């Protein structure tokens, strides 16, 4: 065993790289695409499918589809293809001699883990492997052992209360409101201004618009009010075709649905008031340290003003006498992967690996005994 690989199977962005490094070696979208139109040139260098950056760049001709949906593998053939890509093309590594650590969302279907383990031991034949929950890796990347950790990637949001090394499983909360679903709302509200992105290729353009222009507020009502002075809020964007979009309210309407899921018809509370609820499910003495160590992670905590908005909401909900300190390092996007690249390096962690023999003596059921 030379050096552990660490993989965050992002609903939007796969992150892979070796342990001990402080940044992933390769990051690429978790996209598999098939040619939508028929081929007419002969000997063009044809492939029946493209994955990662190839699919992303050639998107004008491909029916891009995501194997991950809300943190769960919905198609295993394309997922095996993505696994093969991230092993053999990006990392340029034979997985037959590298232990591998995978990061998964909590409360996932047990069959997702069991088939993932069966794949990693029976077609990629890793010597050892382990499954860890993304929030705990973010907490390791924070260099911390106590505090609420809120992870909101492209697939789900989930918060996991940790205190002095002990997890509180009964207080875990989970929402499917996340980056991909948030791009769809932007696709809907852009039609208010005439723009009509409908295809899966234009989904990526809407994602780019969201990432480069969207932001959050200190008071959603005040930002809606400033739309009366309809010049300051608006920002322009240039499509690959050269057409120029201008968007106003939409750039903060989309992120705001994180705090008000009612916009997309969901009943549950926002990204706030679920962290607060998870804190209140914790033990009474636990809460003092949770408010002061509210770590964030994930790509959808990257909108400017997320920290201010959530701090204001949590201070509004929580008692006034309690100091509230949200932790937002600049590397939130890769913090799950960095957490794994720390954890897989620990000399104490070497006993936790599910070895090849520990799999082949007990089948894919081994994960529920070894992993959390």
């Amino acid at each position: 065993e030379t050096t552990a690989l660490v993989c965050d199977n992002g609903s939007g962005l796969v992150k892979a790289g070796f342990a001990g490094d402080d940044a992933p070696r390769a990051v690429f979208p978790s996209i598999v695409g098939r040619p939508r139109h028929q081929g007419v040139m002969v000997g063009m260098g044809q492939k029946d499918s493209y994955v990662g950056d190839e699919a992303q760049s050639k998107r004008g001709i491909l029916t891009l589809k995501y194997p991950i949906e809300h943190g769960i593998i919905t198609n295993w053939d394309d997922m095996e293809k993505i696994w093969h890509h991230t092993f053999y093309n990006e990392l340029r590594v034979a997985p037959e001699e590298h232990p591998t650590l995978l990061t998964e969302a909590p409360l996932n279907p047990k069959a997702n883990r069991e088939k993932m383990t069966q794949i990693m031991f029976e077609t990629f034949n890793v010597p050892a492997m382990y499954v860890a929950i993304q929030a705990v890796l973010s907490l390791y990347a924070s260099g911390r052992t106590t505090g609420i950790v809120l992870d909101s990637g492209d697939g789900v949001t989930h918060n996991v209360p940790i205190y002095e090394g002990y997890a509180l499983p009964h207080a875990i909360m989970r929402l499917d409101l996340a980056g991909r679903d948030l791009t769809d709302y932007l696709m809907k509200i852009l039609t208010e201004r005439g723009y009509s992105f409908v295809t899966t290729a234009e989904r990526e353009i809407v994602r780019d618009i969201k990432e480069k222009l969207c932001y959050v507020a200190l008071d959603f009502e005040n930002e809606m009010a400033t739309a009366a002075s309809s010049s300051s809020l608006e920002k322009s964007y240039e499509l690959p075709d050269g057409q120029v979009i201008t968007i106003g309210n939409e750039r903060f309407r989309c992120p705001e649905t994180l705090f008000q899921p009612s916009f997309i018809g969901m009943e549950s509370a926002g990204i706030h008031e679920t962290t607060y609820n998870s804190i209140m499910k914790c033990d009474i003495d636990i809460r003092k340290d949770l408010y002061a160590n509210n770590v964030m992670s994930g790509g959808t905590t990257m909108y400017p003003g997320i920290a201010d908005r959530m701090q204001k909401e949590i201070t509004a909900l929580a008692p006034s006498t309690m100091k509230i300190k949200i932790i937002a390092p600049p590397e939130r996007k890769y913090s799950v992967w960095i957490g794994g690249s720390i954890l897989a390096s620990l000399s104490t962690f070497q006993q936790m690996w599910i070895t090849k023999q520990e799999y082949d003596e007990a089948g894919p059921s081994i994960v529920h005994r070894k992993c959390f």
Partner: protein, 47 residues
């Protein structure tokens, strides 16, 4: 005849017991602060 309202004291949300935020998703909890501390909590309104 009528008598003055017996206002319910704000519920203290202990880790387990007679009160919890998540048990009723149709109400939001709000701060009922007096003299610089929240006392307990009250639940009402949307979300």
């Amino acid at each position: 005849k009528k008598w003055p309202e017996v206002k319910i004291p704000a519920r203290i949300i202990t880790t387990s017991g007679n009160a919890s935020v998540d048990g009723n998703p149709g109400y939001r909890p709000t701060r009922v602060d007096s003299n610089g501390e929240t006392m307990g909590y009250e639940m009402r309104d949307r979300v």
